[model samples]
Target: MKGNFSSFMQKEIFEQPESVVNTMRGRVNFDDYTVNLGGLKDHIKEIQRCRRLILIACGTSYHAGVATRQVLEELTELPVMVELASDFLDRNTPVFRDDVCFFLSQSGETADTLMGLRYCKERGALTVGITNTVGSSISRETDCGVHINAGPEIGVASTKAYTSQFVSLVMFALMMCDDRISMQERRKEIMLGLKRLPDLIKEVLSMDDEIQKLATELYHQKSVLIMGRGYHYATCLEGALKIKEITYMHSEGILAGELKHGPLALVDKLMPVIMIIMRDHTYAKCQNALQQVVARQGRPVVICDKEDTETIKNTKRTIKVPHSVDCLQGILSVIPLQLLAFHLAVLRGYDVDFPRNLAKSVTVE
Candidate 1:
């Protein structure tokens, strides 16, 4: 396949499902042109000044928006919301004049997404389109925008594009919140993290055999819980979504802190808690939650940072991820998720390439 989306789609034979990981290597230089939010100041100032931020997107873009809501709020404490484009277009969502609206899409031509953007434009909110196509519909319609460089996401299921759109928007949000961020130190560190993603992913992929073996252990379970905090929260949802959509497994993702809020009551000795317990701001608090899980007699399986020392003592079973910058944790953390879903689906004899009834893209009105 094409090396990256910089070129048109390449032959299927040349593309591996993992090509997405390798693309991050070129991202270090991707800071050069297009909408890199490498300049974090301008957008973040606007965000701070705005009354609220309204993010409209569909499918994976909507999911990324979910992640952005968690990350942006943690970094800047600004109010944020995500709405599916189809719902945004059809539901008449309230958009106040002081709000800023962002439209995210891989293929800007997604009818409902573009329709939602057109609706937002009529309401007079400052709109910025985050899209892959440089001059795609949403990009052309917005008052201002950023061209997301995730390369062509040829996979119908959306592996790389989701991460890339996020890379663009989060970097933009971070840069916008840059006054407190040491830009020089942050970018250098973030760039360095992006550089390590490929090899780190390769390192994570080596564990696929273990994951495949583990899948057989959980195939018959009727319920499962995925938990994490900070940026890993959205990833918990993504992982759960992947497994549920494919294997018909009943799963819900939770923030570890919410355990007491009721996800705790479901805890039992056999219930699996897939913890995205990577080392981060929430690590200490997650440690407390894991303690609670043990107290409740729940099963604990942790996806931890390769270098982390905390997870060893915390989780009942642990999987390691190569170290990366805080911003890039989500990137490395998702591999286990994909592998988990793929392996479980295989155990159930479900087709991996084409999950039961899911299409690569759902474009229905």
Candidate 2:
């Protein structure tokens, strides 16, 4: 399997499930029901003191923030906002002294993110860096931080780091709410989900043959569309971004609710649409969108769970991720899409690791 997965992106993509296991190492104490955040332990009071959390990043990291923001909002009971680094830097946003800022970057050296950190620092807001590398510029500049510990990711299009960030932030959310009596049971449920993630990802990875087959059918196509609502929306966007960045294909991720607004006109019998409908708050909405897309004669690939009968009924081609809790479903849902993008890129004979003009880190803004 190691020899067969040749490209850096392929190997890195395969290593993601394992890297998730590594990222959880020493951080979760299942027996004691505690999340060990090391240095963050001392700052529990400070974190709890914050009025809100502003997460800033670029590209994949920004998508990770979007995917994890719901968990943070539910667990922390605070207003959580995800910002694109460049845009955040461009705008003069309000930063309060009690606000907690999280800067996410896989390389730990994204120039726009670093500038955002400095801008927040100047305002006296507490800054935390969630990055893959220790002692990186973002890590050094922030007041305190947690290393994702996803190991070295060589792919310009991030795979492991994306999952690891979601995992780490899930734990961070669990930690922040661990002391609340109302949150204990929910926290335990999510932690158990985290514990089972590595194995579930392996189950998702087992679908690679299926995904590659799906990729072959869609590879020659010029453009693709992905649609989801709620938590799954981030994965849809990230999936489209992955396909666009690596395969040089024109792709778009849209909210399923916006179908009637404008995107509905783009649907045709020839276009391939991937509808993400995990069993969550937005499952019904996605199911509705699936029916609409199929009605429009679009070739649809539905991402659903085993028990999602209505979703399965609409499309013959589907990718079923593991049955995880609502909050963590995106983490599992993204695995198959990552494999799809990687396989499609390879099938199209594009450079899987360094595609066209993209760089691993945007250090120049």
Identify the candidate with maximal TM-score.
2
Residue-wise C-alpha lDDT for candidate 2, range 280-336, written one tens digit per residue:
787777778887887898878888887777666756888887899898898888888
Clashes of each: 7, 0
Model 2: residues with Cα > 4 Å off, grouped in runs: 1-4
The count of residue-pair clashes in candidate 2 stands at 0
Candidate 1 wrong stretches, greater than 4 Å = 1-51, 70-78, 86-91, 132-136, 154-156, 174-183
lDDT of candidate 1 over 1-365, digit per residue (tens): 34553222212212323444333333336454222343232554555777888889887788788877865665556688889887776779988767888888888778888888778778888788887777688878887776666565654455566667667666666455456644555555665665556667677777877887778888998878999877788788877877787677997888877879989988999898888876767778878888888899987888888788757764558878888777678867876776787668767887655666776555565
* Candidate of highest lDDT: 2
Worst 10 residues of 1 by lDDT: 7-16
Error of 1 at 203 (Å): 1.9
Model-by-model lDDT, in order?
0.71, 0.89
Q: What is the lDDT of residue 74 in candidate 1?
A: 58
